[PDB]
Every structure is written in C-alpha cells, then in structure tokens.
Amino acid sequence: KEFECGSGECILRAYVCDHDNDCEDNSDERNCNYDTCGGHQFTCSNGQCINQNWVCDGDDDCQDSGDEDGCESNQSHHRCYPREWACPGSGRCISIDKVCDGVPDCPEGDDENNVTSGRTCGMGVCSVLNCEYQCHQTPFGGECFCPPGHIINSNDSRTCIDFDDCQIWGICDQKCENRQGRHQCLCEEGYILERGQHCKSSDSFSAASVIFSNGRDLLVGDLHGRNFRILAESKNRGMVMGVDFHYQKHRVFWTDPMQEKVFSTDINGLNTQEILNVSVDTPENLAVDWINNKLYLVETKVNRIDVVNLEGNQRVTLITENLGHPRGIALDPTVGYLFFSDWGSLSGQPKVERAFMDGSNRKDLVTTKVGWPAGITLDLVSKRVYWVDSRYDYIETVTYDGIQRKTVARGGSLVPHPFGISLFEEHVFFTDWTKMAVMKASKFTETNPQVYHQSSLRPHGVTVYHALRQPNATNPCGSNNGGCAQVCVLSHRTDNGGLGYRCKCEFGFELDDDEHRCVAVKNFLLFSSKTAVRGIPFTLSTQEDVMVPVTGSPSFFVGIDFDAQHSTVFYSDLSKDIIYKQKIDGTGKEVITANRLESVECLTFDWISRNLYWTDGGLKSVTVLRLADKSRRQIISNLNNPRSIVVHPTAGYMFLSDWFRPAKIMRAWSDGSHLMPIVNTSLGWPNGLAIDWSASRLYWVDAFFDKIEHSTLDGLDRKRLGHVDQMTHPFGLTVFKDNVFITDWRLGAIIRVRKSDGGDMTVIRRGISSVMHVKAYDADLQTGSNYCSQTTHANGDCSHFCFPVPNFQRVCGCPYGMKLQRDQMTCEGDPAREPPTQQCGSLSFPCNNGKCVPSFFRCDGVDDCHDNSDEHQCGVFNNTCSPSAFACVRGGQCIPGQWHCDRQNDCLDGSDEQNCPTHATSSTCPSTSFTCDNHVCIPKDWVCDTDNDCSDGSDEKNCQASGTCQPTQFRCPDHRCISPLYVCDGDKDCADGSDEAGCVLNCTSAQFKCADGSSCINSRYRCDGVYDCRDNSDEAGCPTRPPGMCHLDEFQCQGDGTCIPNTWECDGHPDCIHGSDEHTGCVPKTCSPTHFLCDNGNCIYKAWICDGDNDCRDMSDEKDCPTQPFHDTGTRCNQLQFTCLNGHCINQDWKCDNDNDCGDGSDELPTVCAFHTCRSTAFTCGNGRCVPYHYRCDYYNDCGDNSDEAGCLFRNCNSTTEFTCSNGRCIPLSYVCNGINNCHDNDTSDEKNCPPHTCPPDFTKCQTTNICVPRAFLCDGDNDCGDGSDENPIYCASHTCRSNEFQCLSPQRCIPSYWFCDGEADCADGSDEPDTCGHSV
C-alpha cells in the first residue's frame, strides 16, 4: 500500500520523496526527482518548491528560513560587519577608519568623546585581549579589528573566524565568489572589471546616455551632464510623462497626459509620430518588451495595464482586477516577469506587485511599509528590483522573489518626493518632485544624492539609453507568431509547458478551447459610468475587459445600447449633450445627433428596424431616429420625469418609466401611440426597465420601496422578487440567462442576483464611482424579422421609418414636417402644420456639428462645439475674438484668457508672453501664511513636509535633518515634520505610524461609533440598509417593523398588506392594489374660485389655462383649449361591421379588398371605396384597395392590379433541379405535373399531367389538362383542376349536372346524389338538406 522504509517503518506516499528524512535510513530521500521550480514557485536552499505567496509571510516553510530572509526593511544589523563598528542608537555601522577619528560619523555621534558618558578615545585593555590581527582605539579603549574574511567568534572578541565577505552589501557591484582571496568580484559578459570592485560597460558599445522628462520637454545628456540636448519639444501645452526606448531600433517612446496621446521618435528626433490616441487619457508610465516587440502601457483614467505592439496596432488589456492606482511598471523579458507598482487598490492596501508578462499569477512582491510606491527599475544582472516611495520617502530594493529587503536612501532631506528611477551600472538616477531635479544616486548606500539636472518644473520618469540595458534573449513568439491567431504575448519561460508564451486575441475576440484560434465575441456585460463606458465578461472568474473603454476629457456617460450586426455600441454624454456610436475595437467614432438634446437619460435600439429611441428628461419627451438616414420626431411629448425606455421589436411594444409623484410605467405601440399605463399602483421611483426575451416578461426596478418586480408585457400577473441585501437605491437593470444585473447608486457597485427570487447577491464590481445603466451585449438576441424587414422588399415599403405593431403588423411613419399620403405608406411635405425650424436661435451660434453654443462663445479660445467649429478662422475681420479671450496681434489667432502670460508661449507669435507686469508690489499674504519665492502663499504649518506645495520648492528649501520642527507641526522620529490635521486621522502618514498609533477616536453629535471603535461614520449612514462599519454596528438595532403591521407613519393596504407613507393616504391617487388608500372616509378637496381644480387635485391660476405648459402636471389645464381663435327590417349591425344594401353585415377589414362579401358588391362598390382609406397596418394598392400586408410578395395576384407583387425581388430557383414558375414561385422539377398544381401561376403550366393521356371515370378528366378532379367539385368557387373543367362553361351552366348529381345553391356546386338529401349538410348553407326534400333516418 504505502512505502515501507528499509528500517521497518511505513510513511505516506505524499511525504515520501519530499526532502523530509522520515525514516533514519533515508530510503525515500536516496532518489532525487526534485525538479526545478516553475515561475509561480520559490526555490528553497534544499530544493523544495513552495508557492510564491508563501514567501515572507511569517512561516519558515523552507525549513532553512530561505523564504523568510530579511522581510523587514533592514531595521538593524546582524552583529554589524567585520572591520566595522556598531552605533548603539540606530544600528548604523561604520569602520575603524571613521571611529574615534574626531568626527561624529553616525547619527548618535557616540563614536567620539562625550561629556555625558565620560568615554574617551584611545588605547586600553586591548593589550590583554591580544587580538588575532590588530588593536585600535575605541571610546571604550582598545578593541579588536580584523582583516577581510575575519569576524570575531561567538562572544570571543579576541578570536576571529573566517567570514564570507560575499554577503556584505555592495562588496561587488555585479557578482562575487568567495573561493579565492576570501572573496573575488566578477562581471557579466559585456561589462569589464575596473579596479577590484567596480564593473563598467565595455567600450565596444556605441555610447551611453540618460533620457528624462524636464516636465515639459524630452531631454537627453551624457552620464555626467556636460551637455544636454532637447530631443522632442512638446506641442499644444504638452507634458512628457513616461519614457522608454528600444536600442535595437533606436526609437524613444514617451507618453502625453495633457494631450492624451502617446508618441514615439528616433533618437535623432526624426519621424515623431503618434502611436495611440484612442481610449488613452492619462498614461502615467510606459515600458517596452525589447525582444518581443511590445509596448506595455499604464492607464489611470480607467485603471488598467495594456500591451500594444511598437507601431500601436494590436491591443489587449492584461491586468484589470483590483488594480487601483497603477503608477510604475518594469519588466525583464529575458526571464519573463512583469513588475508594476500600486499606491492604492480597491482594497485600501498599497503594494508592489509581481506578475507574469501576460498578467498571470499576480503576487504581492512588497507589501509592508510601502506607502506610495512609484516607478520601478530592475537590476538585470543581479536580479533585483528598485522602487521609490513618495509617502515614506525612501529608495529600496528587493530581489525578484521579494526577499532581502535593503534600503539605499531614506529621509526627508535625502529623497523628499521621488517619482521615477532607473539603473545603469552602479547609479540609480531618480527624479525628485521636491528638490525639482533629476538626481544621481549610488545603488548601494548614499549619504547624499548629487544633483544631475536642476529643472524649473516637476521632472518625471527617467531612463538610461544603452545597449547593455537590453540584454539579448531568444524570442518564443518568433516561430511563426508562436502559432497564435492574432496576438502573441510573452510569458514566463516555464509557462505554457516551457513554450514561454500565451496566445491572446485583440478586442472583439475571445479564445476558443484550443487557446490558439480567436472567435468573434458573443456575450459580455456592458455598463456605463461617469468616467467610462465599459464591457465586462459575465464570468466573474476573469476580470479583463472585452471592449475598449470609452472616455473623454469631460465625461458623464448615462445611456448605452449596442448594434450587434455592426459590432457597434451607442452611448450618450451629458457633459456634451451628444449621442455617439463607436466600434468595439474603438475605431470609427461618429456622432448620431447633437441637436436639441437635453439630459438624455436612456437609450434603446430596435435592431430589426434600425431605429434608436432616447428619452429627453429636459425636453420631457421621447424621440425616435432612423439610422439609415437621420430622421427624428418626438413621438411622446408631455411627460413629467421620464426615465429608462425599452422596446420589444418582435412584439411591437415600447416601455417607458415615469417617476413624478403619481409614478407609473407606460406601454405603447412602437409608433408612439395607444399610450396607456400598465403599472400605476404601489410605485415610487421606477428607475430601470428590462425585458426577459426568453419568456416575454417585463422586469422593472423600484427605488422608493427598494424592490424589483416582474410581470407579463400586459402588466398582468405581477410578482415581486425577494429581499436583496444592501440594495438601497437601484438604477440599472438587465436580465441575461438566469441572472439579474443591477446597479445601486448608494453602493456604487454592480450586483448580481438570481432572476427567479432574491438570489445569491454577488458583487460584480465595486468602487465604480457614479454608476449608470447596464446592458447585456448578445449577438444571438439581435435576431429576427418582422414585416418591417422581411425579404422580397425593404423597410416594409414605407418611406423613412416603419414601426412594428403588435399582432405582426407594421405602420409607416415620417419625420417632423412630413405627412402621410393617401396610400398611408409614402409621406409628403407638410409645412402648413409643422413649419421648418432653425438649428439655433438668434442668440446662439450654430456649429458645423449639430450642436448649439452661446453666441459669445465664438472665438473664445476654447473648443465648446466639440468640433472646433466655434474656434475656426478666428481673429480675422467680421470674426473678432471674444472679449474674454486674448488675441494674438498677428496671424489671426485667439487664445483663452488664462493662457495670457502664464510662462508658456501659446500665441504663434508669442504675443501672450510679452510686456506683462512683474510688479509683485508690497502685496503680502496674511501673517499666518508662509510666502514662497513665487509669491504664492501657504500656512506656516505646510513648510518642510516634503510636499511641494509652493510649486517652486520654496517651502521645502534649506530643510535640514536637525529635527527642529515648528510647534504646530508634529515630528515623525526620523522621517519628516507633519501637520496636525494628519495626526490621528485613520491613516499612517509617518514611516513607522508614530502619528497614528496610541490615539483614540472622537466624534461630534452628527457621527456614530462602530462597536469596535474602528471608524467614526456619519450619522446619515446609521440605519440605512448598507453595512458601513466592518463589524456591522450601524445596521444592528435598527427599528424593526412590527410583524404584520407597519410603522407609525405608514398606511397599510388592507388588500395586500404592504406599507405606504401616510402622505399618500387620501391624496386622490389610489396607490394600494385595490384602492384601499382612497376610501370613502377621505375628506374631499376644495379649490378657491380664483383657481382651477386640476384632475389630480391641484389648484392652478385660471389665467394659466392654455398658457403653454401643463402647470397641473396633468394634461388638464392644456387638454381643453378651444380658446385659440384665428390670428330595412329593424335590425342593425354591430359597431365594427360594415352594412350592405341587402344586410348580411361584414367585418370592416373585409371592406374594399377585391372580395365580394355582401353579394351585391356594397363592400366593394366604387362609390363606397372612393373615400375609404386603408388602415395604417394594411398595404394600399395603386388601385386603391386595402389588402392585408402578409399578402405582399406571395407570388399571388390577390390585389388584382399586381401592385402588391410589383417590385418584389424573388430568389432565383435552381432551375437545374427546380422549376421557376411564371409567377416567380420556386417548386422542384419533380413536382412538375406530379398530379396537382403547385405553382398556381397565371400560366398554370405546372400541372399538365404529362405521363397519362386520359383518366378513368369517377376521377373525371379535366378540360385542357388531364388532372382527375371529380365532378363533385364543380362550380365550388375554386379551380380544382385549374383549367376550367370544374367551373365548366359546359356543365353547371347548360343543365343541372349528370343524372347522378345535384347542384348546390351555395356554392353553386354539383354534388353526388348520395350526398343530396342524405341527412348531412353537404352544401355550405345546407341547400342539400332542407325540410322540403323530406327523407327519413
């Protein structure tokens, strides 16, 4: 069973051969598989592999403490070092060459004579010690000191044992071996050893230069700063942000957050081109995979990490989950890791993260005491990462596995505010935002960083341009794109079975089960927010987007919908009042309409008729628009507060929600007619509507009672869903498969519940800012065809738009200023009723885009039309600049006033930076506020906090480590001074948390205490339905509604049992399901004689009736406006039946349709059909008849004039095997003269009965074809033969049938004698079975 050792012991198989000795014979440890660990594992000293997350967590998993080595930030030494002395105060180590030399060389200064201790420097008892090497003076007297590779033994100062100098920090810059000379340095290939410690780059490479951003421009210089060259200058107030290069191709890349673009250029400054300009808005940093030809990009408007090729074509998002605030990025393609930094996540934790170069296997590389981590650089030859921190103000380094943390700089006087960093050989160049300069720093330990280039602006990311910075390595994707269909993204060398790459697909595609071939995406969750419009996979197991985010500089997106047949999404932008359309990939952005849009709150798309509906909450109306050609009209106009609208194309219904006090949900035909409420009882704030396509059930969301309901499309069979946890205010709603997706404003999240009950509430997103509608993208849903988009014709034969109508019918419509002609399908101009209108009023400038702007916004220097059309050809005569803008004196250019003398040359001729006042004057800010050299003023409390408040560094100048902060400012022990407003604020602002530890919370009368005291929340959040405190102390103990009854101030519906506010009791509107809240005990409402009592009970001035607006909020005051002046037998048919001259009423749909139904032709008399017009759902022939629409293009001349087969396009039948009849019908050739007619064409050439020349009796012969239709079907109203022999000009017209048959009276049909008077009615009216004929049973 198990494994038995050679010593006679049983050991489990899992612990057999796992580096554990087990039995003393070590039988299970003689064999060695113990293969090298993968990318996701850490390798212990003994060869055991453990998962990367186990590293530096507190557990000695490796049994050698190799995974717990130096996780602290080098708090203190370990017995100091050989030939070095330890300062007791802080653990700093200095050598004897500085000890007792006469200078305090460590922070405590204990290495010299002190008057408080009496210690003196000189010889002493060392004569008795007799040390192994030498004696030297210490303040305690003579003490031992030993050469390299000699350290004192265990509590034996006199005895020195050999030491491994290879473990000392900075002994050799690249590599070290201890087998010879007690140690020896060596260098990687390409470097050349100088002296005996330092490795420098060989002169076989062309040159070495450093590239950094000046804060405005892109600079370059040598390693000593003798000469500096501007590489590329920023245009249009640009700002170089993050820089990286590619030595093989001699290209330098840099991002632009102000211009929201990413550029690239040659090292000579030639061929500067834009790499990306779509969906990239704040590219903080950048990185280049130099062997796979990739460009990894950081984004912070929608926090994500992208990868795009060097030219910028193939794009795909890699990391999106919990990514918070990404700032730094670095990578090592040769080994295969991606390192990126994060100064705050969706969880409050900041961290430095490690990942594979395709986003897999994310790990917290450095987590403790990380503050505000910033850009990251790598030591490609020693396998270490370097990151800088702006909060705790240090530069630190850890290995690729996060072990052996060592600090190279620390303090508010050393690195007050680092941003970027880069290594070359032995120096870390780091930008600092406080000293306002790129600084050169040693990469092991520094007493003071040197200034490399002092700037007037905040500098930014730095890089060192050299070949050795990009070591050579093979390309896993080089073997024919790695076999991937679209994109090959490099990964760890041990990933994908050693192939070292993982296949990816560009936006709009997903990987199949082969993980090699891309397929078009079918489903994803589309949602909108204030900042972006995003598309997310439904499966919560993955997190990355499927569609590019949609974003702008001003942004407030609300409504969204999609067009699956074009891979297109629509959206609105309330900051621009425009409706856009954009592909999934991001290309092809176009506007739909930008004219007369006022707070469009929602959108919906009729995917069969290609009509777009949107709801104007400002105009208080809903509009429809045809995408084929811009054609819009208001179909519902007099609403109060309309919200989300949803349309059902196949059923021909649209649904819209209104939440004014008499809240309701309406339904109407897609035409915009037959408006009626379907849910008006027990509603408040019905925000979101959604439709279950698989069941034709309407789902809607309420926000005043915090409920989600559903019902049939008729509003009947209403059901509520169960209680949903932490739902307080839902806005969006979407039903897809078995899940219901909702968005809550109070949560600021997207939650998922089961669509049949309350469900398992699962949070999809969190911290999504202001969140708006959701929508389920699904290409399978957008399938179907009403009569509006049936083949053999187009658009239902209607000009402009045709509207689907329930019961499978269509109604034609035309835009504003158009009227339907007599045929009810084509529309003519109607200027008499709806005159043409201008794009803008007389006080506003119409842009080239359909928008409208104030007339004094023309030529103000700011693009307000979103087309630059208001800032076009400005500065010339008849086109002067606005009084607010500043005009350049030459060339006709107007610029914004705020750009006038702001130290940037904006005007093309520089007129904006010439002869403006230098007089700061004796003007002074108040005595409380410190004054900078820039004359900006800040309080004294802000000075020397390592924050560049003055924007010129004046408040941080001459700051020193003396530890002598102002009385107001608190002092971190060795970090910086700090303001009181940050002491005891819930956040650790000092490095060690000295400003937060030991304090207590304290709260006013408007706040509440969590039970554990962890936080002091606002009293507004007490008893709200949302768990705010971590211990849930807020919602515990809230008032509980008595079982069955309701609260004190809440009416109860007697018929249902639900609760409504007492303000709704006796208000005139029945809110209860049975109208119990408007009982007969309600006091009647009275109105004054000077007012008008509106139908909802309001009192309004009688002057205001027909004044121009529904002041009652009901149509009452505007409905009744005739005020506008100029300035035979007795029986009868039913209401819907036509009356003939001879009676026998016929239904009105039979009127004037080429069928005689009255007998006398009254339903088809030319006088009757002269004025009659077709119903809107019926096709009008050119003759004037009204055939049902389903008769159109059906091979049959049912209209008579062939007007309904005129213009029909018919699919060509395969004449090689089918027969194309004369009427266009497609029938198989095998069915030609098969026995009965199938074509039924005018030709009637289908059924010729080709083989036989005659037919026997009973099945009698027909006239021109030998079909065997019996004579019993003679004169029966249809041509059974199809050749006249049944209608028979010979029989049934000469004399009454054969001797064995009788002719019926209706139809005039000859029937067999054994049918005649047999006891069963064989004629249609029973003329064969009257009482006259007699006969018996």
Partner 1 sequence: XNXXX
Ligand X SMILES: *[C@H]1O[C@H](CO)[C@H](O)[C@H](O)[C@H]1NC(C)=O
Ligand Y SMILES: *[C@@H]1O[C@H](CO)[C@@H](O[C@@H]2O[C@H](CO)[C@@H](O)[C@H](O)[C@H]2NC(C)=O)[C@H](O)[C@H]1NC(C)=O
Ligand Z SMILES: *[C@@H]1O[C@H](CO)[C@@H](O[C@@H]2O[C@H](CO)[C@@H](O[C@@H]3O[C@H](CO)[C@@H](O)[C@H](O)[C@@H]3O)[C@H](O)[C@H]2NC(C)=O)[C@H](O)[C@H]1NC(C)=O
**Which positions lie near ligand Y, rule CB under 6 A?**
677-678, 680, 715, 873, 876, 878-879
The reply to whether 949 sits near Ca ion by the rule CB under 5 A is yes
Residue 1122 binding result from Ca ion, ligand X, ligand Y, none, given CB thresholds of 5 to 8 Å by partner type: none
If the CB atoms of residues 361 and 682 are measured against ligand Y, the closer one turns out to be 682
Which of 430, 685, 700, 1195 binds partner 1 (CB under 8 A)? It is 685
Question: Which of positions 400-419 make contact with Ca ion (CB under 5 A)?
Answer: 417
Only one residue has tokens 């020896």, namely 184
If the CB atoms of residues 98 and 1022 are measured against ligand NAG, the closer one turns out to be 1022
CA 285 from centroid of its chain's CA atoms = 21
Backbone phi, then psi, for 314, in 5-degree steps? Answer: -85, 120
Tell the smallest beta-carbon distance from residue 528 to partner 1 (Å): 12
Stretch 97-136: interaction string toward ligand NAG, x if CB under 6 A: ----------------------------------------
Tell the smallest beta-carbon distance from residue 703 to partner 1 (Å): 6
Stretch 371-400: interaction string toward ligand Z, x if CB under 6 A: ------------------------------
Q: The tokens of 738 are what?
A: 């078995």
Question: Which of positions 426-485 make contact with ligand Z (CB under 6 A)?
Answer: 467-468, 471-472
If the CB atoms of residues 715 and 1224 are measured against ligand Y, the closer one turns out to be 715
The reply to whether 1210 sits near Ca ion by the rule CB under 5 A is no
CA distance 777 to 536: 10
Cβ of 57: how many Cβ atoms within 10 Å? Answer: 12
Q: Hey, what amino acid is at 907?
A: C
CA distance 40 to 491: 12
The reply to whether 1214 sits near ligand NAG by the rule CB under 6 A is yes
The reply to whether 1148 sits near partner 1 by the rule CB under 8 A is no
Strands of 235-362, DSSP E: 243-246, 251-256, 261-266, 273-276, 286-289, 294-299, 304-309, 315-319, 326-332, 337-342, 351-356
Q: The tokens of 496 are what?
A: 């994908």
Length of the chain: 1337
Residues in contact with 802: Cβ distance below 8 Å, sequence separation at least 6, in sequence order: 609, 788, 795, 796, 810, 811, 812, 813
If the CB atoms of residues 412 and 642 are measured against ligand Y, the closer one turns out to be 642
Q: What share of the chain is helix, strand, coil (3-state, %, to 5)?
A: 5, 30, 65
Binding site for ligand X (CB under 6 A): 35-38, 494, 498, 595-596, 816, 822, 837, 839, 856, 858-859, 880, 882-883, 922-924, 962, 964, 1040, 1042-1043, 1086-1088, 1099, 1173-1175
If the CB atoms of residues 445 and 879 are measured against ligand Y, the closer one turns out to be 879
Tell the smallest beta-carbon distance from residue 144 to ligand NAG (Å): 15
* Per-residue 3-state assignment (H helix, E strand, C coil) for 326-375: EEEEEEECCCCEEEEEECCCCCCCCEEEEEECCCCCCEEEECCCCCCEEE
If the CB atoms of residues 597 and 907 are measured against Ca ion, the closer one turns out to be 907
If the CB atoms of residues 1160 and 1243 are measured against ligand NAG, the closer one turns out to be 1243
The reply to whether 251 sits near ligand Z by the rule CB under 6 A is no
Residue 1214 binding result from partner 1, ligand NAG, Ca ion, none, given CB thresholds of 5 to 8 Å by partner type: ligand NAG
Tell the smallest beta-carbon distance from residue 28 to Ca ion (Å): 5
Q: Helix (H, G, I), strand (E, B), or coil: what is residue 27?
A: helix
Q: The tokens of 1227 are what?
A: 């029938």
The reply to whether 155 sits near ligand NAG by the rule CB under 6 A is yes
If the CB atoms of residues 642 and 846 are measured against ligand X, the closer one turns out to be 846
CB 1222 within 8 A of CB 1243: yes
Tell the smallest beta-carbon distance from residue 574 to partner 1 (Å): 7
Binding residues with Ca ion: total (CB under 5 A): 78
The reply to whether 745 sits near Ca ion by the rule CB under 5 A is no
The reply to whether 190 sits near ligand Z by the rule CB under 6 A is yes
The reply to whether 1032 sits near ligand Z by the rule CB under 6 A is no
Q: Helix (H, G, I), strand (E, B), or coil: what is residue 7?
A: coil
Structure letter (DSSP) for residue 669: E
Which of 1217, 1254, 1299, 1336 binds ligand NAG (CB under 6 A)? It is 1217
Only one residue has tokens 């819907």, namely 1136
The reply to whether 236 sits near ligand NAG by the rule CB under 6 A is no
Strands of 705-808, DSSP E: 708-712, 719-720, 730-736, 739-744, 749-754, 762-766, 771-778, 801-805
Tell the smallest beta-carbon distance from residue 248 to ligand Z (Å): 7
CA distance 700 to 416: 55
If the CB atoms of residues 493 and 1192 are measured against ligand X, the closer one turns out to be 493
CA distance 306 to 278: 13
The reply to whether 687 sits near partner 1 by the rule CB under 8 A is yes
The region of 720-728, 955-963, 1023-1031, 1236-1244 touching ligand NAG under the rule CB under 6 A is 1236-1244
Alpha helices in 511-662 (DSSP H): none
Strands of 859-998, DSSP E: 886-888, 893-895, 929-931, 937-939, 970-971, 977-978
Which of 218, 703, 840, 959 binds partner 1 (CB under 8 A)? It is 703
Residue 1238 binding result from ligand Y, partner 1, Ca ion, none, given CB thresholds of 5 to 8 Å by partner type: Ca ion
User: How many contiguous H segments (helices) and E segments (strands) does the chain have?
Assistant: 3, 92
Residue 468 binding result from ligand Y, partner 1, ligand Z, none, given CB thresholds of 5 to 8 Å by partner type: ligand Z
CA distance 906 to 913: 8
CA distance 578 to 573: 6
If the CB atoms of residues 163 and 685 are measured against ligand Y, the closer one turns out to be 685
Dihedral angle of Cα 1249, 1253, 1256, 1261, to the nearest 10 degrees: 60
Stretch 873-912: interaction string toward ligand Z, x if CB under 6 A: ----------------------------------------
Q: Helix (H, G, I), strand (E, B), or coil: what is residue 634?
A: strand
DSSP state letters, 675-730: -EEEE-SS-S----EEEETTTTEEEEE-SSS--EEEEETTS-S-EE----TT-S-E
Which of 558, 592, 827, 1152 binds partner 1 (CB under 8 A)? It is 558
Residue 876 binding result from ligand Y, partner 1, ligand X, none, given CB thresholds of 5 to 8 Å by partner type: ligand Y
Residue 1216 binding result from ligand NAG, partner 1, ligand Y, none, given CB thresholds of 5 to 8 Å by partner type: ligand NAG
If the CB atoms of residues 184 and 272 are measured against ligand NAG, the closer one turns out to be 272
Residue 1329 binding result from Ca ion, partner 1, ligand NAG, none, given CB thresholds of 5 to 8 Å by partner type: Ca ion
Q: Is the dihedral of CA 1241, 1245, 1251, 1252 positive or negative?
A: positive
Identify the H or E element spanning 1181. Answer: none
Residue 535 binding result from ligand Y, ligand Z, partner 1, none, given CB thresholds of 5 to 8 Å by partner type: none
Binding-site ranges for ligand NAG (CB under 6 A): 154-155, 274, 277, 1002-1004, 1214, 1216-1217, 1242-1244
Q: Which residues are near partner 1 by CB under 8 A?
A: 558, 574, 599, 601, 617, 659, 685, 687, 703-704, 729, 770
